[PDB]
């Protein structure tokens, strides 16, 4: 659902992805609604609209 859109982790990426096992901290992810991009488009889809 997210591997197939926008940002994955490309070879030319300037950054590190750090993930570790912690059960601390939940919610507050669904506060986004000023960030939306297309699925179906006729006018193209530019990354992270």
């Amino acid at each position: 659902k997210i591997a197939d859109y926008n940002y994955k982790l490309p070879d030319d990426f300037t950054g590190c992805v750090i993930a570790w096992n912690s059960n601390n901290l939940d919610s507050k992810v669904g506060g986004n609604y000023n960030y939306l991009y297309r699925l179906f488009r006729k006018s193209n889809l530019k990354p992270f609209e």
Partner: nanobody
Amino acid sequence: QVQLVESGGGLVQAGGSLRLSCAASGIIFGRNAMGWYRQAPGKERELVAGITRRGSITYYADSVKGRFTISRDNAKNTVYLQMNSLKPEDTAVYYCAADPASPAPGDYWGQGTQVTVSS
């Protein structure tokens, strides 16, 4: 995705409106809004209608019409799903979920709700 939380449904009459409520994972919750999937043993599973965030503008297929409206209040951060101008052809099992993706027939999203119109 799965384990969606819904309220509403049951028996309503043709015309009027029915307002459903739903809350869900960030995967569903954070997307356009929540629209409708429906199926019945006489009806193929389809995406009914949706929205591109609150406005006068909402969309629906010509396979199943209805100037359905989807909205979010700020009083409680949930999604309200309102179906307007219902007909008996709308009796189906509904799932209240965002338009991208779709429940698998090899999976089951939340509990769902049953809506029956004039029956």
